[PDB]
Amino acid sequence: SEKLTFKTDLEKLEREKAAQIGVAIVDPQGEIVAGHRMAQRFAMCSTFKFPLAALVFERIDSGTERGDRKLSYGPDMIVEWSPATERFLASGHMTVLEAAQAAVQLSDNGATNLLLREIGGPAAMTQYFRKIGDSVSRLDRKEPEMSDNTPGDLRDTTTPIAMARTVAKVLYGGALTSTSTHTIERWLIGNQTGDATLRAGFPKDWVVGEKTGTCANGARNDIGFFKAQERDYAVAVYTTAPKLSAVERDELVASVGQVITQLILS
């Protein structure tokens, strides 16, 4: 089987790198194409920032939020890795759409928190997950503490299958308006943080958009979509590799991309 090669090659990577690799690839109706440790819990890390943006776009779609509404803040909003937030600090605000674009494309933590403040915290993010049929994914904390990733801790976790299905719902399942869906897809394609991760392992002619994540305890994640042979797919990759370097974890997720490629093209 090509399915067996996919399984075997991922398990080889796991043994060779002392890693656990969660993958779920689903079609646009959320039907399973391939997986590995599908229903296993992993820390979301910054991968939730994509669903957060989707939540914000739904609020705009539903007329409970305005894209250009100015969200004011002072220096307390600045936390580790807040590159855009720090730039806009002097001006005293970012807009909803500015913060969202920074959350998704730069993984900006301060911008993420700025939005969380506005939409009702981790509890509202979780509510959104439930609202779109995701009974698994949960946000419990803001950044940066949500990135702790303590083994056995259910807080701030998802499974590959749950998140792949959330991605498919958001992009293909009619969760957002056509306009909002296209905007989030363009943001994901133009993401600035994923050049060395999943899309490094996909062929150059594939259309791919994604959102990365990094946590404590060696987590390196990448979730999003790709279009291959003119078919659309949603994908969630979650990896943990405590003994690898940061660059080696990027290389691992890229390798997982290569393993996906060979299955798809098989």
Side-chain angles (χ1 to χ4, degrees):
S1 255
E2 314 79 312
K3 294 150 180 183
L4 183 50
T5 305
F6 173 87
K7 185 196 91 93
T8 299
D9 281 8
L10 291 178
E11 298 193 340
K12 284 174 163 37
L13 287 175
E14 286 189 340
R15 292 195 309 272
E16 195 197 12
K17 310 282 158 203
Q20 293 181 91
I21 299 176
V23 187
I25 303 153
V26 306
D27 75 10
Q29 209 234 324
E31 298 292 334
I32 296 165
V33 172
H36 192 72
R37 300 178 180 280
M38 272 196 165
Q40 185 170 314
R41 314 290 310 208
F42 288 84
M44 279 184 302
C45 314
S46 297
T47 59
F48 87 94
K49 291 165 184 170
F50 165 27
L52 179 55
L55 182 171
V56 175
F57 284 19
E58 182 275 322
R59 297 283 188 87
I60 293 162
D61 287 349
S62 70
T64 60
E65 189 52 275
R66 210 194 313 150
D68 65 354
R69 183 166 70 92
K70 302 180 173 191
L71 319 182
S72 303
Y73 61 92
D76 286 349
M77 193 56 61
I78 307 301
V79 298
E80 176 186 327
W81 193 249
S82 297
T85 307
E86 194 180 9
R87 284 157 193 151
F88 283 112
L89 176 53
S91 83
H93 74 277
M94 286 177 78
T95 64
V96 168
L97 288 175
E98 286 174 341
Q101 195 177 26
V104 176
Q105 300 201 125
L106 293 177
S107 204
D108 185 308
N109 285 141
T112 296
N113 291 346
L114 186 56
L115 292 172
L116 282 170
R117 194 188 68 184
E118 289 305 308
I119 64 91
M125 179 73 264
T126 297
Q127 173 172 246
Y128 183 73
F129 282 127
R130 301 296 169 264
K131 171 191 164 316
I132 67 176
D134 187 338
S135 56
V136 167
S137 308
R138 52 181 287 182
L139 189 68
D140 297 85
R141 291 165 294 179
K142 71 184 153 321
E143 292 277 20
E145 55 269 35
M146 66 84 62
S147 302
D148 293 339
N149 183 33
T150 296
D153 192 343
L154 259 34
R155 291 178 298 170
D156 303 300
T157 60
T158 191
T159 66
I161 195 48
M163 187 58 78
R165 293 180 155 172
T166 288
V167 172
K169 288 157 160 71
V170 161
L171 298 176
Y172 311 121
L176 298 175
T177 59
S178 185
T179 299
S180 290
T181 302
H182 189 69
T183 297
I184 194 49
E185 282 175 349
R186 298 295 288 171
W187 283 3
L188 290 170
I189 293 172
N191 168 236
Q192 307 186 34
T193 64
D195 291 350
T197 55
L198 262 196
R199 67 208 289 171
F202 290 161
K204 264 63 221 314
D205 59 357
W206 283 23
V207 178
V208 52
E210 44 61 55
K211 177 76 202 74
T212 59
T214 300
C215 282
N217 303 316
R220 190 63 166 140
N221 312 325
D222 211 347
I223 71 163
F225 73 94
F226 57 88
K227 167 175 242 208
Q229 330 190 266
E230 301 293 310
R231 299 220 330 180
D232 301 319
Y233 302 88
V235 60
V237 174
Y238 288 89
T239 85
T240 59
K243 289 283 273 180
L244 296 182
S245 69
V247 171
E248 281 167 347
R249 294 165 188 147
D250 288 345
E251 293 173 10
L252 174 65
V253 177
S255 294
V256 170
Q258 292 182 136
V259 172
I260 293 174
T261 297
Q262 295 308 120
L263 178 70
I264 298 290
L265 302 177
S266 283

